[PDB]
Amino acid sequence: KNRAARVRVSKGDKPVTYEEAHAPHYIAHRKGWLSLHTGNLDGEDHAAERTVEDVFLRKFMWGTFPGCLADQLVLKRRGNQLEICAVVLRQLSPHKYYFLVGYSETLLSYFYKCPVRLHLQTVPSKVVYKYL
Amino acid sequence: DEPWKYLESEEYQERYGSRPVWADYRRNHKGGVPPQRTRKTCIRRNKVVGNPCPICRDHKLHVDFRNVKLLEQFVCAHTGIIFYAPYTGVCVKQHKRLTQAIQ
Amino acid sequence: EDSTDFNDKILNEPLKHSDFFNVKELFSVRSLFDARVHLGHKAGCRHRFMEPYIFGSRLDHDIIDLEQTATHLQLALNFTAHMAYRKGIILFISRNRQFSYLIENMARDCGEYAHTRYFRGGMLTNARLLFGPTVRLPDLIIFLHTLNNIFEPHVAVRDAAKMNIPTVGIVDTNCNPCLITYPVPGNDDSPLAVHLYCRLFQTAITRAKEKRQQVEALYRLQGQK
Amino acid sequence: SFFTKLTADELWKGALAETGAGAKKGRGKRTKKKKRKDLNRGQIIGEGRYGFLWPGLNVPLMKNGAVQTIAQRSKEEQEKVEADMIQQREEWDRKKKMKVKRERGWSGNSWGGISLGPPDPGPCGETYEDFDTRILEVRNVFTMTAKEGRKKSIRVLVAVGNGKGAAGFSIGKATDRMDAFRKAKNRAVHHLHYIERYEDHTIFHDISLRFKRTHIKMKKQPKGYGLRCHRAIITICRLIGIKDMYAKVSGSINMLSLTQGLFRGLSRQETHQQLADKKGLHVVEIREECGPLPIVVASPRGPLRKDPEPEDEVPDVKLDWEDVKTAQGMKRSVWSNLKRAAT
RNA sequence: AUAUACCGCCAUCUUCAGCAAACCCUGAUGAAGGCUACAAAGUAAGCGCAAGUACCCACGUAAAGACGUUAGGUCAAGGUGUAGCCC
Ligand SMILES: [K+]
Ligand SMILES: [K+]
Ligand SMILES: [K+]
Ligand SMILES: [Mg+2]
Ligand SMILES: [Mg+2]
Ligand SMILES: [Mg+2]
Ligand SMILES: [Mg+2]
Ligand SMILES: [Mg+2]
Ligand SMILES: [Mg+2]
Ligand SMILES: [Mg+2]
Ligand SMILES: [Mg+2]
Ligand SMILES: [Mg+2]
Ligand SMILES: [Zn+2]
């Protein structure tokens, strides 16, 4: 039986998001990609470097906004601009979200030597697609 | 000095309500059939056992022939017989004092 | 202040009369005899609990005593009329497919309900799951046929009792009336018998609903002045 | 390596091993399972080992109307913070170990006799606060399946009652025990019997019945006699509201047959009003405490017969050798009439 | 060291169509069982199949394929519980 990236059926009490509810074979069919860049196009270079950067930013944001992320990050690269789009919860005070945005954008801009912007969308609670 | 006052106070009513002081007591023993005698005494050389009987567990309950409202709790209202000690769980020491105070 | 007078003049007043709706004028032993209500099944099909209602066997064909039917039918019609007066939900049940169309029309015409189709497990004992938590069940179930199509008691007879719903039922000589609240010994097979039953219950229900409006209307006019 | 690190959910799911071949069929004799602890519970965003004070994250942004600047706690001031966090953490552990004491039933490890509380309120705002629930039997039943082999389920018997004559019982089945409790107690309130009580304390007459292979002999008793009955009968009698009764169970001692037999016997008893109406005579009670005074307990509602009941010189009633052996002082048992706690 | 503590990713039946919460009913309220369409106690969320999608079609081939089975494979992908080593 296939296991990869499959949230398994339970008793009907486990809330899953839309991202979680779709196995890998639905990628490009029902669900899109969580990062968009040119490295994996034919004739393009530096796919390995974009992949390492993406893995770091996901770990970095998980621990920089601990308990606040309500879904996976969406990573967008245009030119040398890096856009991080995150769906977060509404528990932390707005002052802390502004501190962490200023801190994260600045720290990541100096780390990867590119202008980095963080876009936060807040939701009252994790959006539930279905109960498995 | 006035033991009958404790039974008329608010502390008593909160602890026991309208049930007898021995209502919630349960003996710890092996088997389904308990020993036919209760423990000799719950206070031994000023030290109290882990599961003191209804009388010994509340030091404000005074077995005295004038505290008739307490004594009534150890007599059957329908037959007038004094409960044997295993009925309420009172130790043998206090059951004798209750029997003498009732008489 | 005004509710006690309402319930006393409207709900309790009909219960002080032996025949408040005059349902005895609807039928007679002759009218039942002409509808062949006395004709029962052969003696080999007799149910033990129907012996008290059987006049006898005429050449191995059981005859239903219409003197008893008349008294049982009086009670059933009277009960049915009172339940319609109180705005109770009356459900007609029968699996006899020859009369499914007739019975479904009789229910619609009187403003009541019919279930003549296959009875699914739990319509009554599991109604909240099937219909919803606020579903109102019937206050009276009238069986024009108490047996299903395999000659066994209709499951709703047992389930009506489980839900404490009174049942009116036509009980032929091969039927089991033990759990039927108001049983009526009578022929359930002949179209003349079945048509009569539908006319009687339809008429009892229609009269009782009209009586409820008359009493209410009078009670209001007198209230203002 | 930073890139080899995983999330807490992954680390606990692995470390706990809740899913695995060992959990499948209880293949291991195991008792104390590791319990996941949330390590982000008492953690404050912005607080670190170095004790830095970040304005707007872990300390206020403005102080005295001016924006605070980056600061660092002193070594002494930071030691206190660490100690205070350990003490806060120890309190979390201590309290979790501390537990409330379960009131036991017929024995310390038995479910029988334990209260489950009132049945849950029905969907249409229906409530059963007046009803108490008691467990009578908790059984692990097993079926064999083709794939999973020996499968484990729970069969529960519970009784419900309000203490005023309305009581019932139901079986509950489920894989989990708490689901069996819910099903049993909620179902029982839909299958209530009403039990008539003489003077709201005892039964109307002696009841002797057999249900399958379980024999139950019950005797009407006066006030103050208490419930001297099988422990399960005691539990059921408290739910009905019977205070004084003797009962003896003989034959197969099966909890379900005992419960079903008990409710059958108690539901099928004739009251004094029913006896008076059936025979059209007065029901006269004679009490030795009240001497020869005749106490009419029930009178027929219909006409009163004029012909005395025939006085058969010798009744052709069947007697129980146990009752006769006892009345003759021949029943010698070390276990009879033993001193017991009030029931 | 332990895959007989596990996460992770899989084999296998599967070239299957079943799994199942919550209720209801039958069996005297036992382990258990629950269908007949000219129908007789089942209603069933959800999961799988199916449907959709990819490839050249609506075909085919891929993909998908539940719950479980074999303490199946892997502590040597990585991570990790327990135990062990630390000149
Ligand atoms: K594994
Ligand atoms: K490994
Ligand atoms: K290891
Ligand atoms: Mg495969
Ligand atoms: Mg017929
Ligand atoms: Mg061991
Ligand atoms: Mg113990
Ligand atoms: Mg294995
Ligand atoms: Mg295709
Ligand atoms: Mg394939
Ligand atoms: Mg498919
Ligand atoms: Mg192995
Ligand atoms: Zn003592």
Side-chain angles (χ1 to χ4, degrees), chain D residues 8-177:
Chain D
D9 286 357
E10 291 166 313
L11 291 165
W12 285 115
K13 193 176 175 179
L16 294 174
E18 289 177 2
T19 53
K24 285 285 185 166
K25 315 192 178 194
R27 292 184 222 261
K29 283 193 192 187
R30 287 150 189 177
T31 72
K32 285 188 181 180
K33 204 161 174 73
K34 189 174 282 273
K35 296 178 181 178
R36 53 186 303 155
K37 168 176 175 171
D38 177 40
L39 297 154
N40 308 316
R41 186 263 308 169
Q43 287 208 65
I44 300 150
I45 299 179
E47 290 295 336
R49 192 175 86 181
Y50 291 164
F52 273 97
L53 305 171
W54 308 118
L57 185 63
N58 56 325
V59 302
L61 178 67
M62 285 159 294
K63 183 176 173 181
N64 305 326
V67 181
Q68 285 196 82
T69 58
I70 297 172
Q72 195 179 1
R73 274 189 288 260
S74 65
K75 176 176 171 55
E76 294 76 8
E77 195 185 344
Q78 182 62 20
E79 290 289 356
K80 175 180 171 178
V81 166
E82 302 281 4
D84 193 319
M85 175 166 52
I86 285 168
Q87 163 169 15
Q88 177 190 30
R89 178 196 67 199
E90 281 189 349
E91 275 184 356
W92 200 267
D93 168 68
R94 161 170 174 180
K95 294 158 186 179
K96 287 167 60 167
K97 288 181 172 180
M98 303 323 292
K99 70 211 185 197
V100 189
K101 306 178 194 176
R102 297 145 172 273
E103 186 171 349
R104 65 163 174 276
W106 307 331
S107 73
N109 200 66
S110 82
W111 288 101
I114 283 168
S115 181
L116 285 173
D120 299 329
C124 62
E126 185 176 3
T127 51
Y128 312 85
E129 302 104 346
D130 200 356
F131 282 81
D132 180 52
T133 302
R134 293 284 169 170
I135 301 169
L136 301 173
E137 185 188 72
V138 179
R139 189 178 282 241
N140 293 340
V141 291
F142 293 86
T143 188
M144 293 287 296
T145 57
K147 292 193 182 173
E148 295 178 351
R150 195 156 172 276
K151 181 212 186 191
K152 182 178 173 291
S153 166
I154 310 292
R155 188 184 79 190
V156 178
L157 178 55
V158 316
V160 299
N162 65 345
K164 301 187 291 294
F169 69 96
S170 187
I171 294 168
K173 272 261 201 68
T175 300
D176 181 58
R177 194 182 304 102

Side-chain angles (χ1 to χ4, degrees), chain B residues 36-79:
Chain B
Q36 294 300 280
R37 291 193 306 182
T38 58
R39 74 169 61 94
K40 180 160 169 163
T41 186
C42 314
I43 320 289
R44 190 176 287 274
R45 297 178 184 173
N46 293 335
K47 303 158 63 181
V48 190
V49 297
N51 191 33
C53 80
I55 298 301
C56 297
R57 72 185 173 175
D58 188 358
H59 71 101
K60 287 172 182 171
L61 293 174
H62 301 284
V63 176
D64 185 75
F65 76 103
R66 298 173 298 168
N67 193 9
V68 294
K69 292 293 188 185
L70 179 60
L71 304 178
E72 287 168 23
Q73 298 182 27
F74 298 86
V75 182
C76 184
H78 310 287
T79 59

Side-chain angles (χ1 to χ4, degrees), chain C residues 16 19 42 46 65 110 122 136 158-159 165-166 176 182:
Chain C
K16 297 173 176 197
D19 201 353
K42 281 200 75 189
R46 194 193 298 118
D65 184 11
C110 61
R136 188 180 158 192
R158 176 200 77 198
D159 287 359
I165 302 169
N176 187 336
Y182 289 89

Side-chain angles (χ1 to χ4, degrees), chain A residues 36-49:
Chain A
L36 283 177
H37 58 87
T38 59
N40 290 317
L41 297 159
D42 185 76
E44 293 295 354
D45 297 319
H46 311 323
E49 295 79 321

Side-chain angles (χ1 to χ4, degrees), chain A residues 32-77:
Chain A
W33 289 286
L34 292 169
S35 67
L36 283 177
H37 58 87
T38 59
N40 290 317
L41 297 159
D42 185 76
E44 293 295 354
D45 297 319
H46 311 323
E49 295 79 321
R50 303 295 81 82
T51 303
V52 165
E53 297 164 5
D54 289 1
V55 172
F56 174 77
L57 297 166
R58 292 180 192 281
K59 293 188 66 48
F60 176 90
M61 288 288 291
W62 184 259
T64 307
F65 298 79
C68 306
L69 290 176
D71 213 327
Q72 298 299 317
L73 298 178
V74 183
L75 302 173
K76 301 171 176 298
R77 289 187 177 82

